[PDB]
Design an enzyme around this catalytic site. Structure first.
Site, PDB file in Angstrom:
ATOM      1  N   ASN A 106      28.073 -11.730 -34.602  1.00 20.23           N
ATOM      2  CA  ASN A 106      27.389 -10.470 -34.831  1.00 20.23           C
ATOM      3  C   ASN A 106      28.183  -9.576 -35.751  1.00 20.23           C
ATOM      4  O   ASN A 106      29.159 -10.006 -36.347  1.00 20.23           O
ATOM      5  CB  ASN A 106      27.202  -9.757 -33.501  1.00 20.23           C
ATOM      6  CG  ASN A 106      28.522  -9.389 -32.855  1.00 20.23           C
ATOM      7  OD1 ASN A 106      29.398 -10.235 -32.670  1.00 20.23           O
ATOM      8  ND2 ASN A 106      28.678  -8.118 -32.521  1.00 20.23           N
ATOM      9  N   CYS A 133      30.106  -7.237 -34.953  1.00 22.44           N
ATOM     10  CA  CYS A 133      31.341  -6.801 -34.325  1.00 22.44           C
ATOM     11  C   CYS A 133      32.168  -7.983 -33.811  1.00 22.44           C
ATOM     12  O   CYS A 133      33.099  -7.809 -33.025  1.00 22.44           O
ATOM     13  CB  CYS A 133      31.036  -5.795 -33.208  1.00 22.44           C
ATOM     14  SG  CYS A 133      30.159  -4.284 -33.711  1.00 22.44           S
ATOM     15  N   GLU A 160      31.769 -10.156 -31.697  1.00 26.00           N
ATOM     16  CA  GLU A 160      31.799 -10.378 -30.254  1.00 26.00           C
ATOM     17  C   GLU A 160      30.745 -11.343 -29.724  1.00 26.00           C
ATOM     18  O   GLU A 160      30.997 -12.068 -28.769  1.00 26.00           O
ATOM     19  CB  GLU A 160      31.719  -9.052 -29.495  1.00 26.00           C
ATOM     20  CG  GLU A 160      31.178  -7.888 -30.307  1.00 26.00           C
ATOM     21  CD  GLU A 160      29.892  -7.304 -29.742  1.00 26.00           C
ATOM     22  OE1 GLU A 160      29.277  -6.453 -30.428  1.00 26.00           O
ATOM     23  OE2 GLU A 160      29.491  -7.688 -28.617  1.00 26.00           O
TER      24      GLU A 160
END
Ligand code: DGT
Ligand code: DGT
Ligand code: FE
Ligand code: FE
Ligand code: FE
Ligand code: FE
Ligand code: MG
Ligand code: MG
Lengths: 294, 675, 684, 281
Positions: free
Chosen positions: B362, B364, B366
């Site tokens: 994604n 980020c 994560e």
């Protein structure tokens, strides 16, 4: 007139003062001042109207040093490398000067700015201090020229530098003082230089002439201070912080004298500054085969 | 006079003679904020009865939700909240809640909700009508344990609402249909406010031939351009692009940030490090020549495993670059512009339990999940609906969890609440996502406050006893999630599709938790779990659970994921992620004065030797902790490294090597000291 | 001692002798060498037409789907006959252009497989679909030079590994993200195989319109423009256009994306610009007054029909009237001003005189936008989609099947009702096969309208040939009655077509053809040649100029049986084929006696106007020296007859003024022009 | 004396000159002159000796522009904000001079600097070119001051500004040239402002007086023109590019004339130089 070799130097400071005063050079458009608007608004009718007036007062000083202040001290400097520093200071004062107008535009209106500008023109004690230095500048006395300037540079700005400072100690107009602090740090230097350069022409003097200078400084300070008490008693009237500003000045008066090889005058029960204000005065390669390891 | 909460908050930047912090002035500012802003701006209601009624009729709240409970029980629950005794923690907290989260009027001058109100609404939305569960969530968010992600918290229960979950992982395929669809996918997802990442890995390299005729394709760069513009259009509004480190463009893909608003993420396989060891070159294989010869899209083959063979195959065109200088350029760009984010392909797969191969992450770093390619007719309709990834999120306050003894209940309520989000997430704008989320039940249970908690119980960060807790912690959260997930399947009578191939089904996931090291390595740690009333799971709990799954399955595909909690941490009072605080008092660029200050939780003038700021705690320590989490969490963990402005490329590369070797699943971006 | 390469031969075209006499021979010389030096040493020599097709089919070059619709007997014979028509190329550029850009080459490009006639054959065969007599018909219509299927129908016919047959497109955007999205995609899937597209911006909400009742939100049209702008720069071949009303709020900034005073910040660089000016935009300029740009949002809100679907000239005062419908205000005399300032530097914007188009419109509904070359003017209908982008209501969008006729060669042929007939059939055929998969709004609209675009070329050729100074009494009057006779025949054909099939272009009963209100102006007198020169020229050519009797028989037939095509003709500018078929661009004047072309490994390939000698130079004045007047004059007479649009390039010197462009723009309006291409400035 | 108001500016140009002249802030230590080190050896003994000698007059030039140039013009200024910009220029020029004395220490040696400097006092084509220009700074006549200021900035400077630009084109000492890139860019505005404010002064001087100075511009600029010819020819002596710099001074003295409002003096054939020197500008 001989050209400048910044390589065969006379005095140590010429270079390191040049290395500082140019490193910390700054511009007022670099500080986000639009963010102090909300805190500005919360200040009273009287409070706002003061903050304007003291900056206007700050302006006059800064302006004087720029056009008639530092300029006149060129004629007294010894090392050709000092005058170059002097010219920078001259300029820098004018940036100090631009700032308030960069504030004035941002926080307030020219309806309030112009009433404080026209007061500044007519306000007796502010013009007096502007006058005292001027009569010692156009004077042909070179040693007294520096003292006066030190007393301006190290002390005069501070009857007004207290308010943007005090505010900062409350969490109001932090960024206005953020910009002021950069002025301060430049003017700190200014004081040390002309001061240091004062002691220098002084140790060359007559032994008996050294008494003459020592008294006059205190006297002049004593007059400039007298004025300053009446200067603070008028503007800050109706706030009741006088006692803190009157203390600040004392501290900022020792600051000047200690830059001129002279010992402090006001005892620390008069120069008693609140530490919060004192606090507000200032806050590639490669890799290795190795490194790769595992 | 005059002490506006904003000048009052500012007092957190100032000291006293011994070296003090004025916490006093923060809680004082809150008290000020409620009386200079909130209660003079809120509107008063005689009873919740009108409150509910008028807010339905006026068009703010949604009746679609409440009507699933006896209207009696709604005001029964509301009362329970406004009597839970919730007060606020930080000034920023209440500031962030009120300005960004809480429900205000259409014109925007009056407040219509308060904290305890927002919870109730979410608790009623997520529970779909379950009286016994609606209650539990209210309590769990209020006590401050469970905390739904930014979009979920915000939107639930409102009629005039956005989307329940922002965050999307959709791949692009090597055809014009899919490119097109993807450029649209941005438009429909970004306009709803989404955070989308794309898998460029598959597309034709630069200089690749199209339609049999040679040297034609533009590369991966110009596809970005479009996506950038699409994100630029639809505002809120941010995107990321992932690329494989062994795609022939990688350098000119990295070069774009040497194309402003996109985020770069590079997937680095094990063999890249191995090449980077002996100062060797890399091989970048043509995504086109793989398709032809090996009948599979680039992003879908074990680049590490094949490598030798690939280099031997003459039909696959190999492009050569410097391994040592790759990691270098990667560092160079991170120094400046943050990314590239990193995710270590094989590391991830290795300990992936789900059938298949993950390829991207994604925005980020994560979210880490498996996906399948989607096939389109020429009119952009789905001949085969593939699977792409959507991320339902929610986090736990490590500290607040550790206090209440029914950690189980704390977990179920949260996992169920999280699951409920997927069962309501129907992004019709892009079907692969929706149909994928319809078979996967993908969730991501997060953590936060680790630093707060460790330092609260007195443990220094990165310490032999720190890691020791955070390891035996995740261990025990994991068990409860898997249990909650197994139970759920038992109740719904259906597992996530593709389970019959999961390692949970095989039981080679349970292999780890049937050995040892699963008893505390420090006495200080054991004390916590003794004192906290938490029974650490014992071999025959796993052993009972193994055989439970191997019957009913689990209803969720992937259970946990720890995000770099955005604003949600400041609402729930938490030390950011499972990493150290960025500073003792976070300076944040917000609102009127341009900055609001945030003091770390459980901080006093006494324990100030615990709250060492991230930057100088060091890189290694952070990884060390994260390692212990990476152990248990099936998805990735958002790992942000904190270097001093004087640090050099090596430092970064050196830190990444370690991180790699320590077995980190995913790396976020690297932050330098400068504020 | 040797030297002379066929290129050096063609450059001689630009060199005179003493006073100045054109070396026409040194181009014809070049032709002979071009074949002797390059063509024939590079062709594949096939021992008999029998092994050819047998080699060209098996090896996967030629499309067996076509050839197997006739007994090879006929195919072989047709071929044999095509080559026996004795075709010879006319000018160098003519030959050169064909081989480098059109003819069939081996996979490796290195050899040639087809000669001019070979192409023709295939084309002729592909278009016939299986009709022996029509195939033979087409063969002759093309090789004589009377017909020329436009570039994309020519180059891509017959070949197995082939691209689309049509390459001009008109798509519309609706005020919702689905269509916004679907637009970028269509800009992709169409431009990818060299398809020029035009977009309808008129409908989108303005530069600050609220979204979902939440105030001041929407970005404008610029950002959608930008998306497309780059999207076209990807699919490369790849030219895009956009159309937006004069009274749509963003109009002043929309015009300012092309303005140099930008770069990134308010800048578009590849997209072509189209501006729709309704009649009233003039009335407001007259009394110096301001323009009232309305909110497409507030119009869609109150009225129930999207912006460009309702009247703007006819509803102007009634829209200032409604206070619910928002109002921005700017200068009309400065709008037109900026246009010229944009026109001066950039060329655009184009112009579509909304109402002059709608009043001549014989078809059901309204026309809202035009194409990249301002020559397509058809009525569309919006489309509706699910949130997943699946089409829910597949509305009509416009694809343009184009063809052309050489005015000179047409007047040379005996039968003209065959010359035109054939032309129409082939076009119809093109539009009977255009199953555009990627944007079904264009495919099923085409499958409904059966719209075709027959062009006209070599006017300033035929005129100059027959001793007619452009834009003279003789010119005007002729071209008037030329476009006249072509029209009738075009319709008679469409009627017969609609009779062979037993069906009409859907929604016929609403057309002005179905009531006979089309035949109105053709049944009031005026159709006698204004010049006996023109009369004796129609005699010489042997053309039965359509009688008042004919215009009844047709009327009564049309009303009875119908017509197979919504639209029959549109006149585009010829930029490629006008060199294969040796034609003087459109119906507008030549560009210079010897035109310079920036093509091939010289940088200069020179092209001499058809029929031009060292005797008749006074007939061959470059469009610059003509004066935008005469040009508009000739265009007006054409526009009288043609149902679609006529692409109008105006021609200005570098001494021209901001008013000079503005001035012409009005003479075009007043004389009844439908549309405007862009304005050129003299410099090379 | 009254305090400054940059919120009621008088002339539009005042701030225009301010903003960018203050944005055009730079230091010799910002540019790494540690880079021109390998490329420095590739010059001959006489090429390297003239490296200093060209910049030595230039060191004295900013010395006089800084100490004497603007300092006399601050009584001439009409807007107090004009007094402000001049003082930056004063200061900026001291750094310009410092920049040359940053150069004589990154690449140049102790022995060699004590030869071009002492030469700059034994050099009458330099001596006078600074004596005359100052004779108008220490004259009570303001337009004499500003004209001198103009031609110093825009002509007399450009004696040695060609050397690094020719150097730059061959890739030799370009990071040294990257600095004179900054220097000139400042003198550009310096010459312009002086230039613009010369033209404001002529709006008040009478009909015959405009030619008392128009004609007086020529006597002086061509007086210091031939003293520059002297200085150019014994410096660019055995180099060969004495005549490319011949075309250089007829280029920027047509820009110096432009930097006063007048018309350019030297035709197509005298103002056209090396097109590869101007590309590296
Ligand atoms: N810029 C550009 N890229 C294209 C074009 N056609 C294809 N591509 C790129 C984008 C896709 O990632 C990849 C494959 O696209 P397609 O499926 O549309 O190619 P197509 O099936 O016509 O031929 P193929 O069998 O894929 O070689 O190549 C084009 O016309 N322009
Ligand atoms: N800048 C921007 N424009 C948008 C966004 N969503 C839609 N628009 C623009 C493009 C469309 O022309 C127009 C209407 O879009 P939609 O029909 O998709 O909006 P929706 O139907 O959800 O509600 P609405 O029609 O606005 O009442 O607004 C957005 O997120 N950002
Ligand atoms: Fe100052
Ligand atoms: Fe100072
Ligand atoms: Fe200078
Ligand atoms: Fe200068
Ligand atoms: Mg393909
Ligand atoms: Mg809508």
């Amino acid at each position: 007139i001989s050209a400048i070799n910044w390589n065969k130097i006379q005095d140590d400071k010429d270079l390191e003062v040049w290395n500082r005063l140019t490193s910390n050079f700054w511009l007022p458009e670099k500080v986000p001042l639009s963010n102090d608007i909300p805190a500005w608004q919360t200040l009273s009718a009287a409070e706002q109207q003061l903050t304007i007036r003291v900056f206007t007062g700050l302006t006059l000083l800064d302006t004087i040093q720029n056009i008639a202040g530092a300029p006149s001290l060129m004629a007294d400097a010894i090392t050709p490398h000092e005058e170059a520093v002097l010219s920078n200071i001259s300029f820098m004062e004018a940036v100090h000067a631009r700032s308030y107008s960069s504030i004035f535009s941002t926080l307030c209106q020219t309806k309030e700015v112009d009433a404080a500008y026209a007061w500044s023109e007519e306000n007796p004690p502010l013009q007096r201090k502007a006058q005292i230095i001027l009569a010692h500048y156009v004077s042909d006395e070179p040693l007294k020229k520096k003292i006066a300037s030190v007393f301006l540079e190290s002390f005069l700005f501070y009857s007004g530098f207290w308010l943007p400072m005090y505010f900062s100690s409350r969490g109001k107009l932090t960024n206005t003082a953020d910009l002021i602090r950069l002025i301060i740090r430049d003017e700190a230097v200014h004081g040390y230089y002309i001061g240091y350069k004062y002691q220098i022409a002084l140790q060359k003097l007559s032994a008996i002439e050294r008494e003459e200078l020592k008294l006059f400084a205190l006297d002049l300070l004593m007059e400039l201070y007298d004025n300053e008490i009446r200067y603070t008693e008028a503007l800050y009237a109706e706030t009741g912080w006088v006692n803190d500003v009157k203390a600040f000045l004392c501290y900022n008066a020792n600051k000047a004298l200690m830059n001129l090889g002279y010992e402090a005058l006001f005892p620390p029960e008069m120069a008693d500054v609140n530490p919060a204000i004192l606090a507000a005065l200032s806050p590639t390669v490669e890799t290795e085969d190795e490194d790769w390891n595992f | 006079e005059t002490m506006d909460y904003h000048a009052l908050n500012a007092m957190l930047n100032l000291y006293d003679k011994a070296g003090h912090i004025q916490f006093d002035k923060d809680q004082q500012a809150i008290d000020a904020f409620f009386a200079t802003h909130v209660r003079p701006h809120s509107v008063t209601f005689a009873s919740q009865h009108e409150r509910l009624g008028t807010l339905v009729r006026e068009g703010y709240y949604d009746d679609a939700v409440l009507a699933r409970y006896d209207r009696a029980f709604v005001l029964r629950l509301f009362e329970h909240a406004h009597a839970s005794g919730f007060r606020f923690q930080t000034f920023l907290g209440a500031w962030k809640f009120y300005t960004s989260y809480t429900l205000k009027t259409f014109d925007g001058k009056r407040y219509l909700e308060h904290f305890e109100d927002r919870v109730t609404m979410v608790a009623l939305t997520l529970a779909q009508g379950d009286e016994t569960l609606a209650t539990q969530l209210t309590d769990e968010m209020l006590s401050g344990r469970f905390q739904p992600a930014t979009p979920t918290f915000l939107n639930c229960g409102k009629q005039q609402r956005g989307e329940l979950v922002s965050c999307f992982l959709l791949r692009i395929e090597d055809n014009m249909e899919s490119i097109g669809r993807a450029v649209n996918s941005a438009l429909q997802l970004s306009k709803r406010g989404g955070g989308v990442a794309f898998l460029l890995s598959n597309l034709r390299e630069a200089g690749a031939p199209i339609k049999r005729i040679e040297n034609q394709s533009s590369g991966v760069i110009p596809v970005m351009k479009m996506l950038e513009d699409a994100f630029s259009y639809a505002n809120q509004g941010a995107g990321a692009v992932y690329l494989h480190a062994h795609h022939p463009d990688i350098l000119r893909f990295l070069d774009t940030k040497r194309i402003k608003t996109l985020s770069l993420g590079v997937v680095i396989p094990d063999i890249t490090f191995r090449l980077a060891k002996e100062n060797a070159q890399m091989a970048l294989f043509s995504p086109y020549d793989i398709q032809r010869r090996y009948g599979k899209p680039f992003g879908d083959i074990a680049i590490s495993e094949r490598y030798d063979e690939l280099i031997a195959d003459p039909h696959v065109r190999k492009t050569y670059i410097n391994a040592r200088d790759f990691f270098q350029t990667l560092a160079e760009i991170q120094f400046e512009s943050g990314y590239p984010y990193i995710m270590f392909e094989d590391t991830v797969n290795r300990a992936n339990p789900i059938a298949g191969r993950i390829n991207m992450s994604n925005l980020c770093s994560e979210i880490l999940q498996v996906n399948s390619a989607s096939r389109y007719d020429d009119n952009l309709d789905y001949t085969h609906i593939g699977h792409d990834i959507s991320c339902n999120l929610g986090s736990l306050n490590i500290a607040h969890v550790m206090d209440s003894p029914d950690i189980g209940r704390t977990v179920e309520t949260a996992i169920r609440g999280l699951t409920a989000v997927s069962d309501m997430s129907h992004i019709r704008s892009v079907p692969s996502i929706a149909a994928g989320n319809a078979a996967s039940h993908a969730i991501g249970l997060g953590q936060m406050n680790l630093h707060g908690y460790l330092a609260r119980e007195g443990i220094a960060y990165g310490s032999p006893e720190a890691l020791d807790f955070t390891n035996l912690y995740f261990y025990t959260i994991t068990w409860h999630a898997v249990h909650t997930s197994m139970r759920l399947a038992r109740e719904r009578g259906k597992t996530f599709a593709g389970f019959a191939q999961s390692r949970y089904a095989s039981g080679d996931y349970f292999t780890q938790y049937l050995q040892d090291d699963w008893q505390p390595k420090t006495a200080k740690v054991r004390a916590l779990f003794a004192r906290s009333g938490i029974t650490l799971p014992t071999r025959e709990m796993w052993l009972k659970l193994r055989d439970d799954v191997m019957r009913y399955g689990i209803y969720n595909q992937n259970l946990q994921a720890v995000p770099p909690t955005g604003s949600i941490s400041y609402i729930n009072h938490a030390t950011s992620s499972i990493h150290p605080i960025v500073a003792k008092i976070e300076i944040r660029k917000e609102g009127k004065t341009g900055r609001v200050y945030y003091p770390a939780p459980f901080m006093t003038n006494e324990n100030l030797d615990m709250y060492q700021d991230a930057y100088d705690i060091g890189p290694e320590k952070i990884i060390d902790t994260y390692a212990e989490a990476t152990r248990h969490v099936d998805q990735g963990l958002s790992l942000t490294l904190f270097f001093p402005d004087t640090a050099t490329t090596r430092d970064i590369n050196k830190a990444q090597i370690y991180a790699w070797r320590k077995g980190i699943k995913s790396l976020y971006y690297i932050r330098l000291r400068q504020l």
